[PDB]
Amino acid sequence: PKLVTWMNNQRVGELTKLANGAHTFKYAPEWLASRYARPLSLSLPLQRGNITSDAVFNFFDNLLPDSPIVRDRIVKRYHAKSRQPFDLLSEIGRDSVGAVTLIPEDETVTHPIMAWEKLTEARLEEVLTAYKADIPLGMIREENDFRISVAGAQEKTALLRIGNDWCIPKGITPTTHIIKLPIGEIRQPNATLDLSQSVDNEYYCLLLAKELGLNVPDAEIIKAGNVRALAVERFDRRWNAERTVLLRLPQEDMCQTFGLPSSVKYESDGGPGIARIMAFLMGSSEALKDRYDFMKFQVFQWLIGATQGHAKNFSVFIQAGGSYRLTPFYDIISAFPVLGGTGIHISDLKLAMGLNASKGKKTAIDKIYPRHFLATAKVLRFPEVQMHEILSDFARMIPAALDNVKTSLPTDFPENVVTAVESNVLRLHGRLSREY
Ligand SMILES: Nc1ncnc2c1ncn2[C@@H]1O[C@H](COP(=O)(O)OP(=O)(O)CP(=O)(O)O)[C@@H](O)[C@H]1O
Structure with missing residues (x-):
């Protein structure tokens, strides 16, 4: 029971559902024997023979929806054999996030590509x-x-x-x-x-x-x-230099990057944080820059209050030769417009990955001050002289940012969303001015 795995149009190997339910992948010799070849994932590098790692499972399980309902439908839709990452993918495994493509071992391709x-x-x-x-x-x-x-x-x-x-x-x-x-x-x-x-x-x-x-x-x-x-x-999709062929961009997130399951995606649940991911960005292609834009994205999240910025919301393109690099920052939402007399106070909004605090990690967005952002970089060998610059620019830029945006908003756009956001972003921004 195979599942031929292609990357764009070149063959990488084949996923297979074992007789007991386990998942095994094996890279095709064609792929292995090529100076321009990359792994399926940084949780399973190139190698001869079969692979059984819980990683070869988690990788594919993350390639499916994170909602029971959606998967509850995916099944009845095409009558999937089961609810396991394989049998489900056998169905909708075609165009997925990244450049991985799964095709049923027997129903071979004809039809214009x-x-x-x-x-x-x-x-x-x-x-x-x-x-x-x-x-x-x-x-x-x-x-x-x-x-x-x-x-x-x-x-x-x-x-x-x-x-x-x-x-x-x-x-x-x-x-x-x-x-x-x-x-x-x-x-x-x-x-x-x-x-x-x-x-x-x-x-x-x-x-x-x-x-x-x-x-x-x-x-x-x-x-x-x-x-x-x-x-x-999609930032993992690109046409040829002249729009002749639409190619894909091998990519994966920070949960697959570490071979970790979908479950353990929240640091509080044993997931990775600013410390495990940064310490990993030191090996990135444009590492110097990748380490910078990251830290900066923290302030931004803390500023616009993004309480769902977990490990599954960060990726890395898999560059030829197994090397990698950070991707753009997808999925961005503020919890501010949910506050008020709705039984949810700003003292309740916590961040996904906490910062180096005086005792462990600090998450409540209503408690994070400049000192926390620095102590974070201090501990993570991230040049301080480079973090001050970040907290800095923010102090000087945000005020105007929240304005230039107001002028570039639709007509039917909820005048109230902006209200609940630019107010809090501004209250928090204040903690910055008062230092920088
Ligand atoms: N613009 C984009 N280009 C490429 N990949 C993108 C993308 N926006 C999102 N993705 C990819 O798809 C995944 C899910 O999208 P997104 O994060 O927007 O979902 P959701 O908003 O459904 C997530 P959740 O509610 O679980 O927090 C991401 O983990 C990422 O790999």
């Missing part, structure tokens, strides 16, 4: 409201070519845009976007989250992120009838 199917304005709304039909990742039933897969827990979908048209890829056509819908859970301790308007909030956050010289993905708000969904330009 890269084929899709344009979508009518009135049909797109379907793909966007597929949950109403009990469908996973928005994959219309009529067809059957739809076999995408995406991580996360939010009701989303991924499509292929050609020129000025929304197309549902076919066979193994790489999707170019990730249209996420305003439904699902978020985090903090013991408590999940329902906030403002997913799209607006996220959008806003990305706008500030970008306006704040922060590297994030290209995304715009869209509307298919009465469906306000957000579509982000």
